[PDB]
């Protein structure tokens, strides 16, 4: 069995590298922004024996700014470097945002009569939709167990992008879209709330001032899903949550009381979000109630008939 596994493992690693190399070669040959003279040179060195991950990264993936394949390379190489990983995530998000904005612009010109730039093939997804498509494609290929998904660093960055680029209600997007994304991808509920707590305590920009209203809304949505999950898992077994989650919702209520007060005394006139915040207060209290009941004994009596 040992000799079998060692060969199955060598073939699995070399197959992972080979697919990366094939994805690169195909993309480079098809890229409009690559001169023909270079493409023939790329085809010579990549359509043959499998190359090392260093070369694939330095000589090709990094030169062409294929940041998604850079991340797959950091995964195949067991690359321990959080800072470079996050730099690559930041470049991939920004590159995709600019590409989505460009395609929506070209569209708006068609729907208005103008002419596109020469050699531009004529309702493309909003930028936050194309961005999260990129995150999904990588996650399914790396399985979320990778070091290219440090949720403690990657979730705040994605939330930062949503704020600093208005990927919120103004354009008709769900303001909780970053949370939906990572939950559906299979991030455990406890880890989400744990990170969101750290976002709220440290107050790193842009998560500052009255925009912590949005952080509280994410916490509300995450805890809500967590409660639903626990209730579902209890019914499941008929046929972890600590007091820290309750404390976190209390502080969240205090943040909302602070934001509303500051909003009422702003220069130029009171803030327009008065009832929007009053609603969030009710939701947060409802969640603290549910969490308090579960913590107080209703969680050990979930498999029992009522």
């Amino acid at each position: 069995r040992q000799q079998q596994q060692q060969l199955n493992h060598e073939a699995s690693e070399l197959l992972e590298i080979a697919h990366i190399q094939d994805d690169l070669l195909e993309r480079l040959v098809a890229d409009p922004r690559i001169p023909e003279e270079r493409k023939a040179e790329i085809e010579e060195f990549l359509d043959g024996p499998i190359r090392t991950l260093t070369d694939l990264f330095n000589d090709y993936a990094d030169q062409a700014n294929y940041y998604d394949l850079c991340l797959l390379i950091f995964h195949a190489a067991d690359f321990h470097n959080p800072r470079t990983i996050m730099d690559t995530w930041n470049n991939l998000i920004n590159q995709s945002h600019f590409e989505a904005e460009q395609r929506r612009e070209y569209w708006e010109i068609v729907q208005d009569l103008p002419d596109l730039p020469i050699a531009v093939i004529a309702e493309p997804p909003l930028p936050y939709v194309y961005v999260s498509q990129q995150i999904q494609l990588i996650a399914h290929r790396t399985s979320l167990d990778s070091l290219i998904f440090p949720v403690n660093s990657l979730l705040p960055v994605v939330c930062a992008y949503a704020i600093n680029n208005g990927q919120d209600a103004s354009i008709g997007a769900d303001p909780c879209w970053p949370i939906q994304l990572f939950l559906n991808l299979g991030v455990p509920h406890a880890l989400m709330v744990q990170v969101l707590e750290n976002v709220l305590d440290t107050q790193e920009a842009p998560f500052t001032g009255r925009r912590r209203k949005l952080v509280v809304q994410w916490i509300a949505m995450a805890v809500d899903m967590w409660v639903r999950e626990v209730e579902r898992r209890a019914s499941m077994s008929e046929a972890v949550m600590g007091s820290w989650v309750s404390e976190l919702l209390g502080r969240a209520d205090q943040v909302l009381t602070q934001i509303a007060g500051t909003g009422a005394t702003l220069r130029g006139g009171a803030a327009s979000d008065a009832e929007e915040i009053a609603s969030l207060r009710r939701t947060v209290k409802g969640l603290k109630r549910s969490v308090d009941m579960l913590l107080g004994g209703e969680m050990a009596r979930m498999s029992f008939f009522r």
Binding site: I34, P35, E37, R38, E41, T52, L53, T54, F57, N58, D59, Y60, D62, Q63, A64, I73, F74, A77, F79, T84
Partner: peptide
């Protein structure tokens, strides 16, 4: 085994020779 070396590469956007 990966080793990044931004120093000396080959200009991916320039022909050879």
């Amino acid at each position: 085994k990966l080793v990044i070396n931004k120093d000396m590469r080959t200009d991916l956007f320039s022909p050879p020779n």
